[PDB]
Amino acid sequence: HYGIQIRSVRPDQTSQTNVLHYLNDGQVTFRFSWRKNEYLVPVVMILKALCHTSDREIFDGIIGNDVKDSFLTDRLELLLRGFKKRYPHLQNRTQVLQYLGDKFRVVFQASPDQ
Amino acid sequence: ISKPVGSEITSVDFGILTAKIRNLSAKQITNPTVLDNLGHPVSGGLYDLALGAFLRNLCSTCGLDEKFCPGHQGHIELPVPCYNPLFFNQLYIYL
Amino acid sequence: RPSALRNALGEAFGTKKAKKAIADLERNRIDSDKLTDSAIDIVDSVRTASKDLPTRAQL
Amino acid sequence: DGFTKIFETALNEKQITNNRVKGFIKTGSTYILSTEVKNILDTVFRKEQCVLQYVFHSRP
Amino acid sequence: SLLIRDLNDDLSKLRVIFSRLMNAFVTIQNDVNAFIDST
Ligand SMILES: [Zn+2]
Structure with a gap:
């Protein structure tokens, strides 16, 4: 039932909604409506597409500190391993x-x- | 109250009209356009004058004007026997 | 125009990728060897039922 | 489908071998034209007339 | 009904025309279906 909904508006007051869903697999998806349809890309596809990232820059940006926080470091390697398993042919930006x-x-x- | 009614309806039967609705109506309808120029109803069309009086013209069936014609039924010949969508679930069971 | 998207089988809505299998399995081959190679018997009874239907263009 | 078509799905290759053991004594989901449903169900209703004389009539 | 008689002449003097003949039977069904119901 969870999710993060943002409403982004351009400088010409035209809007765009980007909802960020949580699956029960540790999987997180990115949702948007382009024409009148609705598309569901995984998030670390975008996080590796925006800028040149390692998989520790994504780790540190989420796990800033509290490495010992066991809840976060286990949800997260069903999301970093879940990209390397599903998309092994995507190495750079x-x-x-x-x-x-x-x-x-x-x-x-x-x-x-x- | 000065116009009494004698005979009265007491029970209604449901049924299915057979293929011989053609017997109660020899006024088939072919031309899909309902009117032509000069505002007239074209013969064989859906506003044919054998279906009831219309546009200040007498009925070709009753011979009566627009106030006193009951109106009559015509029929469109389907070229191939499509199924009735009410009874479609009740033939797909027997199929 | 035919099936060049393949965007619902990738990343789109759950019933949007259910309508691709609907628009293909319900769309049936009307040029099949079972249907076309016995379709002389079809038209040999349709002219019995479409007879008083006129064609013209003089109007 | 949605009340416009009827399909006759392909009988799998196990069951034609179960047919031809008796009859001696096509593609996937072929279409069924509307007139050939009538030519089935006319002959069924001619044969099962007894049971359908009482399925369809609640008074005598 | 007229358009399937327009194409009923296309076997009296005689593929692709049966892809429009079978297309006509779906829409002669889908018109009498849409005459009685609309859903
Ligand atoms: Zn009249």
């Missing part, structure tokens, strides 16, 4: 965007030269 631009190519009306 310029290859996850290749994956992410491939699936969303039809919906954003992308041209054949992009």
